Write a protein that binds this ligand. Structure first.
Ligand SMILES: CN(Cc1ccccc1C(=O)NCc1ccccc1)Cc1ccc2c(c1C(=O)O)OC[C@H](CCC(=O)O)O2
Ligand SMILES: CN(Cc1ccccc1C(=O)NCc1ccccc1)Cc1ccc2c(c1C(=O)O)OC[C@H](CCC(=O)O)O2
Ligand SMILES: [Cl-]
Ligand SMILES: [Cl-]
Lengths: 149, 149
């Protein structure tokens, strides 16, 4: 499970926030895109996999699962592309809670930037650094390092 | 040194590739931008610092050191902004070598994408996964996890 990630798409201000969540740690990366296309999703996964050791991605919906551009990115980056069916129903609730948390943080910073993308990156920073006591950023590094060793 | 990063700007195809290098590991993040501005640099640092525990950034040039937008990003993200003067002359050679390596990789993948940004992300992936035997991606995680513990 050190290599498992989950995609998540949420909406704000008539734009799309694409999120990848490292399941085991709750660490996230995110970007603002005008719309959630296969090409946007593919590029996002390519970035993610160059930065972290991404073994498996649970796609956020059936369109991204189906997308041959997304499949091409997963092939390129050596990622196992999987569906995102919540066989464990707790997954649904976790993601919904996360989207609510992120939107709350974006609200708290929204006046510190003109553009939504800046606010989203501020929210990523706050989420990943928040101690709950370790932070998600500490947890992901410890989980992966333990795996390497 | 787990928290020390160096900025680096290189050019290709009439575009700018902005790179951050984790000094102790050689791990990199990079993006393609139309031009180096304070705003682009500030946004890049904001992204980097939300993803890794960035303590100190050696700026790539004096304009980015001076830029009040870059200083504002460093303030926001809790980064110590420093100059990039190669007091150790080996620094110069390392960054030059890295730029040549990255451009080499970009050439090797260039026909696998229409857009330069895609090729740059492929190059980031290849660089960070390359075993030198550990990869830069393994070294950065080990270095940071050892720091946390
Ligand atoms: C579609 N294209 C096809 C292609 C075109 C030419 C040669 C090979 C291929 C090919 O299939 N390569 C294999 C491959 C490797 C990795 C990932 C996917 C496929 C690749 C691609 C995907 C997402 C992008 C791209 C590009 C691009 O061509 O550069 O460009 C920027 C864009 C930014 C986000 C947005 O703007 O949506 O995301
Ligand atoms: C310039 N602006 C000033 C500002 C405007 C309104 C309110 C507060 C501030 C303010 O000073 N906040 C403190 C602050 C926090 C964090 C970093 C820097 C400053 C902030 C900013 C920087 C880089 C960006 C932005 C933005 C934006 O406003 O959203 O937008 C996307 C753009 C993308 C890259 C490109 O397009 O160059 O990079
Ligand atoms: Cl972090
Ligand atoms: Cl990696």
């Amino acid at each position: 499970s050190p290599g498992i990630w989950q995609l998540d798409c949420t909406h704000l201000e008539g734009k799309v926030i694409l999120v990848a969540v490292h399941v085991a740690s709750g660490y996230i990366e995110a970007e603002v895109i005008p719309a959630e296309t296969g090409q946007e999703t593919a590029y996002f996964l390519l970035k993610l996999a160059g930065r972290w050791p991404v073994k498996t991605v649970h796609t956020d919906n059936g369109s991204n699962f189906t997308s041959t551009t997304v499949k091409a990115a997963c092939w390129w980056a050596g990622i196992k592309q999987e569906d995102g069916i919540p066989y464990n129903p707790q997954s649904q609730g976790v993601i919904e809670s996360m989207n609510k948390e992120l939107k709350k943080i974006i609200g708290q910073v929204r006046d510190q930037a003109e553009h939504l993308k800046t606010a989203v990156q501020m929210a990523v920073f706050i989420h990943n650094h928040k101690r709950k006591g370790y932070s998600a950023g500490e947890r992901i590094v410890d989980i992966i390092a333990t795996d390497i060793q």
